[PDB]
Amino acid sequence: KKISGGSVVEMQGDEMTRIIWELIKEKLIFPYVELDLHSYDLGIENRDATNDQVTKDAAEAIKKHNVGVKCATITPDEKRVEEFKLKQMWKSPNGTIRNILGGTVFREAIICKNIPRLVSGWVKPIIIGRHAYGDQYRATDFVVPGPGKVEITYTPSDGTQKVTYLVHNFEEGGGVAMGMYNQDKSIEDFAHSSFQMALSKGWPLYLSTKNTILKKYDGRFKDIFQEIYDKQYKSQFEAQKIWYEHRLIDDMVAQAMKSEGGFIWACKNYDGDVQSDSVAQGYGSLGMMTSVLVCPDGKTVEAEAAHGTVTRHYRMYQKGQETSTNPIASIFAWTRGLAHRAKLDNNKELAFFANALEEVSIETIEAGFMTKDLAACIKGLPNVQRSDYLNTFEFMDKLGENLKIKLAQAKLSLEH
Amino acid sequence: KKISGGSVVEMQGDEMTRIIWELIKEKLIFPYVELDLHSYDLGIENRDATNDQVTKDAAEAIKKHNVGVKCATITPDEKRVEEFKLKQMWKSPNGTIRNILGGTVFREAIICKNIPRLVSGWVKPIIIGRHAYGDQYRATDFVVPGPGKVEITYTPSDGTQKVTYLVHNFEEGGGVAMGMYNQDKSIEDFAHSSFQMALSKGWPLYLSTKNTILKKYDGRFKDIFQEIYDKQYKSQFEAQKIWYEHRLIDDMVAQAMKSEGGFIWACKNYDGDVQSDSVAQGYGSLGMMTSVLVCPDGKTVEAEAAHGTVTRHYRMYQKGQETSTNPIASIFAWTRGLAHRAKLDNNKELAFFANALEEVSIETIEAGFMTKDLAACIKGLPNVQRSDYLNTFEFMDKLGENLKIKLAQAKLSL
Ligand SMILES: O=c1[nH]c2c(Br)c(Br)c(Br)c(Br)c2[nH]1
């Protein structure tokens, strides 16, 4: 007897993280949970073979089944095109999925008592709410080949007017130009999700923009957040002795760095990409971070392993060398996805399991059993010896052992 | 007898930094240096009164005299428009000046042995090379009022073709849109300045972009840097056992944070704005940072006090309250400007003076005499008592006393 998991959309990935993904399912999920798994191969070869259609199909399946769990993938560059003999330099699958679903990607460090922080003052968590739609991630950028005029136009759908703004007149040589946008409804959804997250955690909320420079573009984010706060959330914030404030991005980063944590940080798409990584590194390890896309319907989520594909480790693995790759981000993509699945299905057994696997992952590391990266955090990379860490397989074995113990003990406890 | 300073363009600023600016010239510069000072009032009231023309005139005067020194100014928002009863919400004077001059803004922490870092590993300096032209700082952004099509077009000056790219078709409601650009020549100048800085310091250089997303726009920065490195700087870097590498911005920040410093970080305009402040905060204090615009001609510079205008302190000052405002950024705008002036004029006396004032500023803080902000860095703001710091006037007095001693001793040593 396994737990009835329900419907989950899974997206397979690339390189080392693809290997780890299969170990996780084989050792940590499948022995305990029975799932109706809707699998999509987002490996670079399958994306190339389906002309990136598999990415769009996976995003539509998430809309249908409400929970997706995604493995980290390769976003190809010139070198990758040559390596895999790709038809095109395919766009980021994350950008494609996020553009289809919309929402806010909430990112937070996975804290272990024995991992030292780079920022000693951060005693409370920092949650990054990254706007997942538009801006640089759905932009139109091109090379300007020589002298000439770049203009940007708006034509309302009634056809009664046309506005033409001059971007730049290139007089000597060329350069680059780009157009980008955002949608009012997407900004409103981002605001609602940020206010709701601040209220569920009982922490103040800060929105960062550069509205002093982008008066109209960033000014709209600032105006939409303020308007929604004043009309729908101000009394709720006052009741919990918390607040909402707008800050300039350069002021916000410096304020975050010298703070003690304990706040929600609403970031525009590009800033949330950079800041979520910086904050994760500030808590100790870039890889020790959750990443959950919360869609506007309040029912759909996509949990992911946000970090790289770890090419260096993958090359070693191919050459038959020993590797010690951290699987926690991939584990927490599963647990966060299963926890949301459990919440939708009112499934106490799956809710218990998802939480238990997160506890086991943290308790394992805190018991002194970890991969090379985490061992380097504690000791410093030059002082790390083979005895200080477990290889990928040894670490997964330790986790499997600890998970079995935790679930067996919980079964025996509820037997009265 | 005073030192013959030469021609310097000065730009007066706003609020608390304006007060401090006058104290600096009165106590630290004028008693020792005779200057042909070309003064421009970039105070928010004068910018409003001249319809922001004073900003453009100051930028042209920098082109002419090759040295500018700028006080921090207000970039107005809605609240500022009401406060000063402004005709318009005037654009950032820094954006206006940088757009006219072009170049790279080099930013670096001002290190004092007794100020604790937030990042314990940073034992060597991090120099940020911020591209000072285009991108978000010369963008065309607007509100999209409802459903309709946003398009971006390119028309070559020969008129033989027209490219129209669809930005977005707004189907339900409106939003926002923007167009932005950069110039090949400006990118090439940014590359040259970054490679030259890395070679003068003997440190590796990293360029950060998001070329995996903005394949064409950021790809051009990456291609121009690589092309210039391979053709003009690779052997020079190999001779100093240093290197140049491109990194994705999110990877670069994490790598910088866990490093020990000791590198040049070439940043695009927007990233250099955020990262220069983050790095300054990592070394201990946001305000303890130099900011020098190095123009493409290799002759023109604009040194500035890049931090805030300290409105909170200014309000206290107006109410007759005691204030303790750090003047170091404004002092180093003067010293960096005078050092460049001295280099152009081959003036050993001015070169000595500029360096001496930087030494005095650091030695004064290291002797335990500092403003409230620096005292809070050492003790923690709740543990700071009035006896731990000097007010603005007391601190400026300490510096003046120390500067007089240093210059008198150097004169006697001749
Ligand atoms: O953009 C960012 N963010 C950031 C942080 Br959150 C830290 Br702790 C640090 Br030390 C630095 Br350099 C940065 N840069």
Ligand SMILES: [Mg+2]
């Ligand atoms: Mg990232």
Ligand SMILES: [Mg+2]
């Ligand atoms: Mg800044």
